[PDB]
Write a protein that binds this DNA or RNA. Sequence first.
RNA 1: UCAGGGAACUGAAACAUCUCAGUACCUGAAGGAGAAGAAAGAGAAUUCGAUUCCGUUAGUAGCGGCGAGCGAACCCGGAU
RNA 2: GAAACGAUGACUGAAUCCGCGCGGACCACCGCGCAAGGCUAAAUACUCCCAGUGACCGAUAGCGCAUAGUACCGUGAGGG
RNA 3: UGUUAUGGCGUGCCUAUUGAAGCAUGAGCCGGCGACUUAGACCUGACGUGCGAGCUUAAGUUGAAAAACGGAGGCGGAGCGAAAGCGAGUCCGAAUAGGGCGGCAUUAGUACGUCGGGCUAGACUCGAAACCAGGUGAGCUAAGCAUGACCAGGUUGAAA
RNA 4: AACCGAACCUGGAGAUAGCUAGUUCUCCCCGAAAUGUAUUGAGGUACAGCCUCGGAUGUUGACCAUGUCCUGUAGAGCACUCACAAGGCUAAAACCUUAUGAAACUCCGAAGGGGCACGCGUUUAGUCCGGGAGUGAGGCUGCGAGAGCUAACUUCCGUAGCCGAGAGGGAAACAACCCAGACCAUCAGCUAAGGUCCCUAAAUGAUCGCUCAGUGGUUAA
RNA 5: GUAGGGGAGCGUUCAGUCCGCGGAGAAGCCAUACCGGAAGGAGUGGUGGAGCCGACUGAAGUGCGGAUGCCGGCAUGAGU
RNA 6: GCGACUGUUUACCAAAAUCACAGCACUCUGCCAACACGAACAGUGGACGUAUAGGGUGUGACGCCUGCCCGGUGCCGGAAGGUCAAGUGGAGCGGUGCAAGCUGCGAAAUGAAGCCCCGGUGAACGGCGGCCGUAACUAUAACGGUCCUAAGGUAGCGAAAUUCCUUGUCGGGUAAGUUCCGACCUGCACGAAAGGCGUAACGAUCUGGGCGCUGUCUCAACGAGGGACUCGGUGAAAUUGAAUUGGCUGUAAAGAUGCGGCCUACCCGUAGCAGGACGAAAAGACCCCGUGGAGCUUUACUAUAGUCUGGCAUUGGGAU
RNA 7: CCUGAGAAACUUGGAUUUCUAACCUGAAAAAUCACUUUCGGGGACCGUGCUUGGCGGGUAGUUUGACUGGGGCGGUCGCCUCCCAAAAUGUAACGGAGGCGCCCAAAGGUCACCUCAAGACGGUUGGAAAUCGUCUGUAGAGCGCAAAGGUAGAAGGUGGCUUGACUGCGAGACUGACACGUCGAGCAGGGAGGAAACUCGGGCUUAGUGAACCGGUGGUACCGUGUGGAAGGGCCAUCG
Lengths: 84, 54, 65
Amino acid sequence: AHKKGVGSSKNGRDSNPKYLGVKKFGGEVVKAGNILVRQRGTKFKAGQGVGMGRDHTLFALSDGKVVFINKGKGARFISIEAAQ
Amino acid sequence: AAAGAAPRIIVKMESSAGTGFYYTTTKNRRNTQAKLELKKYDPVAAHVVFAAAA
Amino acid sequence: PKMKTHKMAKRRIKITGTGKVMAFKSGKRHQNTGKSGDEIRGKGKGFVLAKAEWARMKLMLPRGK
RNA sequence: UCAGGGAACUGAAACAUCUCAGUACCUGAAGGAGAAGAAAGAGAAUUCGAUUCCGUUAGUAGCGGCGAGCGAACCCGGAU
RNA sequence: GAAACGAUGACUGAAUCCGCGCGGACCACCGCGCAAGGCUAAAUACUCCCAGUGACCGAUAGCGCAUAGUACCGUGAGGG
RNA sequence: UGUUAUGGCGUGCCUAUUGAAGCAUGAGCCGGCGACUUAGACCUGACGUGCGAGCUUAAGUUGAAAAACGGAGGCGGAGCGAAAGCGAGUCCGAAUAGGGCGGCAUUAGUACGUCGGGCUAGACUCGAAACCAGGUGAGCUAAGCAUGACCAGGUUGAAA
RNA sequence: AACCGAACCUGGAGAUAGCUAGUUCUCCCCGAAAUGUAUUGAGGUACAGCCUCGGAUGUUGACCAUGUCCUGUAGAGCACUCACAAGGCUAAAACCUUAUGAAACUCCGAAGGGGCACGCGUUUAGUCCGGGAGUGAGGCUGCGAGAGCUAACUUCCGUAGCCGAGAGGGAAACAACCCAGACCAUCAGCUAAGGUCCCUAAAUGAUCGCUCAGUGGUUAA
RNA sequence: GUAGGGGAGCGUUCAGUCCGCGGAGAAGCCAUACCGGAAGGAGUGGUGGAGCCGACUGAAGUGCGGAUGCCGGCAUGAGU
RNA sequence: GCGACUGUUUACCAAAAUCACAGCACUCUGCCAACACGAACAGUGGACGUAUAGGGUGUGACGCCUGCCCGGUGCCGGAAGGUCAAGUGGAGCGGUGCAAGCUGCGAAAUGAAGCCCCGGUGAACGGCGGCCGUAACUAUAACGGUCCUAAGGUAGCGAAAUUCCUUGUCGGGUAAGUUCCGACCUGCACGAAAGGCGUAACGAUCUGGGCGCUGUCUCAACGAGGGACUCGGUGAAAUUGAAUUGGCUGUAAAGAUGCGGCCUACCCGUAGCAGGACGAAAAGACCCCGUGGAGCUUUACUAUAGUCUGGCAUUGGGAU
RNA sequence: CCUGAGAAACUUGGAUUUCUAACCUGAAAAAUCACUUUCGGGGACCGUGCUUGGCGGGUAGUUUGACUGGGGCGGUCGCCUCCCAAAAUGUAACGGAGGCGCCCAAAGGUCACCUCAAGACGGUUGGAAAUCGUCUGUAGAGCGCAAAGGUAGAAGGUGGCUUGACUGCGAGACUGACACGUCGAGCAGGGAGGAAACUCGGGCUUAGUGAACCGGUGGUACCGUGUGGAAGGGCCAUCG
Ligand SMILES: [Mg+2]
Ligand SMILES: [Mg+2]
Ligand SMILES: [Mg+2]
Ligand SMILES: [Mg+2]
Ligand SMILES: [Mg+2]
Ligand SMILES: [Mg+2]
Ligand SMILES: [Mg+2]
Ligand SMILES: [Mg+2]
Ligand SMILES: [Mg+2]
Ligand SMILES: [Mg+2]
Ligand SMILES: [Mg+2]
Ligand SMILES: [Mg+2]
Ligand SMILES: [Mg+2]
Ligand SMILES: [Mg+2]
Ligand SMILES: [Mg+2]
Ligand SMILES: [Mg+2]
Ligand SMILES: [Mg+2]
Ligand SMILES: [Mg+2]
Ligand SMILES: [Mg+2]
Ligand SMILES: [Mg+2]
Ligand SMILES: [Mg+2]
Ligand SMILES: [Mg+2]
Ligand SMILES: [Mg+2]
Ligand SMILES: [Mg+2]
Ligand SMILES: [Mg+2]
Ligand SMILES: [Mg+2]
Ligand SMILES: [Mg+2]
Ligand SMILES: [Mg+2]
Ligand SMILES: [Mg+2]
Ligand SMILES: [Mg+2]
Ligand SMILES: [Mg+2]
Ligand SMILES: [Mg+2]
Ligand SMILES: [Mg+2]
Ligand SMILES: [Mg+2]
Ligand SMILES: [Mg+2]
Ligand SMILES: [Mg+2]
Ligand SMILES: [Mg+2]
Ligand SMILES: [Mg+2]
Ligand SMILES: [Mg+2]
Ligand SMILES: [Mg+2]
Ligand SMILES: [Mg+2]
Ligand SMILES: [Mg+2]
Ligand SMILES: [Mg+2]
Ligand SMILES: [Mg+2]
Ligand SMILES: [Mg+2]
Ligand SMILES: [Mg+2]
Ligand SMILES: [Mg+2]
Ligand SMILES: [Mg+2]
Ligand SMILES: [Mg+2]
Ligand SMILES: [Mg+2]
Ligand SMILES: [Mg+2]
Ligand SMILES: [Mg+2]
Ligand SMILES: [Mg+2]
Ligand SMILES: [Mg+2]
Ligand SMILES: [Mg+2]
Ligand SMILES: [Mg+2]
Ligand SMILES: [Mg+2]
Ligand SMILES: [Mg+2]
Ligand SMILES: [Mg+2]
Ligand SMILES: [Mg+2]
Ligand SMILES: [Mg+2]
Ligand SMILES: [Mg+2]
Ligand SMILES: [Mg+2]
Ligand SMILES: [Mg+2]
Ligand SMILES: [Mg+2]
């Protein structure tokens, strides 16, 4: 006549969002200590003027202007060059 | 954390300096067995090494 | 009826010269062996509420103290 | 008005301490009022000087599942 | 609550002047005080009743009533 | 202006809703009654007014076909700290680096009124089922106690 | 004592009521939301988000172009992972030719999007300080997905538009579709979607064809 | 243009003041083709029989179709 | 079938298989009895009764009977020990003053009832059960019976007021029998005072069958009386947005007299019918929701009348 | 003046026994009582009063979450990773898979050194795989645990020294409604490794978590109710 279940899911679950990616893009002014990429790994390597926290977070060290170096795929660098 | 705590325990590292100051971290008892001996700063002087008080 | 002062807010909130509202950062009572030492340091402290939370506190203590 | 006895709804967005509230109600005794009163006091100036009442101190000091919420007194100014 | 002080139900129970009681655990010191015996007007409260007033009402308003606790309902309390 | 014929056009109102002519709610009709208010000498803004580095009284006193007195108090005047305390500085600290603040490149408050809103109170109006207190009820009904009343006539035929 | 899972009367008492109803005079201006997270929370509330009034600023907003950086979808592709079609070859695996599927494969990889600078060029918004809110049930269609049976006037998200809160013409009728945003007056003119045999405003229009089945006027192997 | 915010007003009682009407007739009631952007407002006439309009200012028990709202009167069902 | 019986019950939907009952059992109670109503050392019921009496509990005439399990729980009893509150006892720690002193906290040992623990207890609460293998597509009617917790059904009964599979299977009755009866045992999920199986008699009980008789029926007629109808008299009600209130098919919030198209229809009423007007009545009583309510239950939390218990007081003397 | 005891006494108790004037209770010319006595009996118990602990649905007040293609049953509730997610972030479902509530005293700091899986040829136990060698060898391995990104000029394997798994701070950003959360240059004290430039305020990264409240503990001498102390609070640390 009717049915009695009984099944469910073992799924559903997921994890709260991890707002990643670059926050500071090609040709952008930058204050000292402004963050420029959140990333899982070495996706973007620090160049001149940019350091890297343990989160592999890239944060700029001395003001200036942001510049993206794509060195042919899998090896890429972000840097600051000050204006003048 | 919780009571049962067989491996790893919150131990407090109290100074020899007799200042009053101490620290806290965790030791496994599988590998420390006897005691814990560490060399950290003391802010009531400067840098005087502590032992693993209960 | 004279509006009473919200006695909870006595020990946890501060009025400022200009007219903003302050409190102490939180998580400092058994979340310790965490730690990190810079957290523990950063927490014992004090700080200003974001903003939306201002009106209420102001209404909590009419005398400012 | 004083005294003996003394609720719950409700508020705590549930509830038990708490709150409603010593309110409602019940009983008692008494008057045109009654109560209270002549410091084993308040208090911190070695200050004040019977009690009651008004303003004020003051939503201060404190009370509190330190939650909801409850909340003086001294001084000072009056009425007598 | 660190809980002083008053207050009694139970048990117990001291000093009387170089003595006694307090001052918020507790001690010293420094201050305020004379418990266990009584009465006391005045300022204060209320408004059944009386008088004056009103940016109160004028017949569904205003008291429930231009009067009635009547008619009427209820065994009754009571409602009206 | 009234009234009409005919043509075109046209899904009552309210409420509640994603969506109402709805076969969803309310409503017989008309007349009256019928719902955002009051209070505090509370809080916080807008407008206005009076004083203005100052502004203001409350109880009360006297007067009172009016109002005046009354400075006790309250608000500005300095902040910062857990506080002591320090003070255009202060707090963390051993000093630094910082937070709050003063200066700032300037900034006026206070008393009253009207208004917007907050709080506390019945707090826009109407509506529970319930909870508690004190009382009224066994002239109905459930039973008890004392005291009386009543059961045509017929059949059956136990012990002794 | 005509309704007893606790009588009735009065009182506390205007109990409480996150619930349902109801909420009254006119015109003018702007004008939402039904999203997010948190809640003994899910038809309730807090804070944001969105509305309005006021005071501040003073083009900071908007669109669109140029420049520059970010991306892993569409496709495609098989280089890894998993899966797979015929054959070779070998002791089956690896490997060789041929051949292919993929949300959780990627050698690659668009259109588009997002940030920043200008404004090289148009247009009007913005931001902050303070008062008042309301909203937190959404609804359909297209496109993009999951769930579902590539069912639902289905459910849950992304995105545009409309309804919601939108009257007017069209689609017979018809929130949503197509055209189109109604300050008022007119027995005035042009148009949009959609239409021009009669009901019904407007060519029983023109020319070259098609179908003869009322196909027109609803389905398939 | 819904919730909502803002702005300018209409009408009602009471109150202060000014104007001023009223038995050759007030308020209220009744009819109406006039006026104003709307709440609304006047003109005339009929009613009525003793009070009342306009203006500015102040204070509200201040504007109804709803609430199975309340009181009241009268309809329908029916000459059933 | 159920209950033995006469009786009793839900005023106003249940009269029964409910309750009560005589009989039976367990147990408590020695009298200021237990038990119960009470502000209460008052008073009273019990009862002016006295264990052949009284209370409480279950079973329910009568007959034959009433098995196994004391692990858990509850009651009765035991006691070596582990126990446990106030108190008794303060070794010892601090505060203060110069100190005599005043004073803050406070350990042993001791310390009641009760629980732990030992035994007993069923006409105490209760328990008397899990299961092993089948030809084929991740499977339906049917199966024979070994048996874990303290134990694992003695009689009697069994498809039952108890049976899921279910119209079980056979027999009976019937032309035909999902009901009834008998037998069977494979009792989903009987069973012995929550009584088991019988039982003459009793029943406005329930169930099946027969005889008789019949308008219950085939199948309805005729008749009567009382309404309904007509006239004179008196004259309600629930309901009601307003109504100028058709049919089909369609559309609309998805069930249209009111919207579209088409069709039908002169105006008004009387007696009649009940398809519609999602007709009337009761703000659904099912269902969900509300950090609504209330009655009830417990080994849910918390308290508490009552009650057991140690110490203090009434409260005294003596002897060992 | 006595260690330990023997007589006597005050005893102050503990238990028992017993007596009676408290108290309780029955009888007789006076019914409930009061008398009085024969009294008779009981008896310092019972009763009652304060306190101590136990039992106590007899009564009493209340509690008994939410999500949910109606509710209940089942499942689920915080955190991390991947896909969905439409090439920026974000984005729901009782959509599709999988982990966490730790671990490490070395698996950290620094310094120095080393390079993997796998196949092919040949090799005593072996002979699928063991251990050795040669050749190939960009990751086809490893990283304590899930997976994603990452990584061979190391994060991977090994050794030396070590306690930066540090106090006092924090320019500036990411991110969230708030509270949170995350990254972090640089200054001071003061240290570790390095010859040194230098690096180190834990771990390749992303889960390994709990706001307040009340309390434990080590320091501190801020307040301490006439003053000076002390109880108590406050501060930093820290445990539940
Ligand atoms: Mg309550
Ligand atoms: Mg409550
Ligand atoms: Mg009297
Ligand atoms: Mg005392
Ligand atoms: Mg009149
Ligand atoms: Mg609906
Ligand atoms: Mg709406
Ligand atoms: Mg209708
Ligand atoms: Mg309707
Ligand atoms: Mg409804
Ligand atoms: Mg109706
Ligand atoms: Mg002003
Ligand atoms: Mg004001
Ligand atoms: Mg209000
Ligand atoms: Mg009755
Ligand atoms: Mg009410
Ligand atoms: Mg009340
Ligand atoms: Mg507009
Ligand atoms: Mg808001
Ligand atoms: Mg621009
Ligand atoms: Mg593709
Ligand atoms: Mg290529
Ligand atoms: Mg919501
Ligand atoms: Mg929603
Ligand atoms: Mg949506
Ligand atoms: Mg849908
Ligand atoms: Mg439209
Ligand atoms: Mg239209
Ligand atoms: Mg049309
Ligand atoms: Mg539609
Ligand atoms: Mg055209
Ligand atoms: Mg034409
Ligand atoms: Mg408009
Ligand atoms: Mg006037
Ligand atoms: Mg008048
Ligand atoms: Mg009406
Ligand atoms: Mg009705
Ligand atoms: Mg009426
Ligand atoms: Mg007639
Ligand atoms: Mg009729
Ligand atoms: Mg008739
Ligand atoms: Mg019977
Ligand atoms: Mg009978
Ligand atoms: Mg009945
Ligand atoms: Mg009957
Ligand atoms: Mg004992
Ligand atoms: Mg048969
Ligand atoms: Mg049979
Ligand atoms: Mg029986
Ligand atoms: Mg007639
Ligand atoms: Mg007609
Ligand atoms: Mg249709
Ligand atoms: Mg029609
Ligand atoms: Mg019509
Ligand atoms: Mg009929
Ligand atoms: Mg209902
Ligand atoms: Mg007791
Ligand atoms: Mg209960
Ligand atoms: Mg639920
Ligand atoms: Mg569950
Ligand atoms: Mg995208
Ligand atoms: Mg969403
Ligand atoms: Mg608390
Ligand atoms: Mg301490
Ligand atoms: Mg201390």
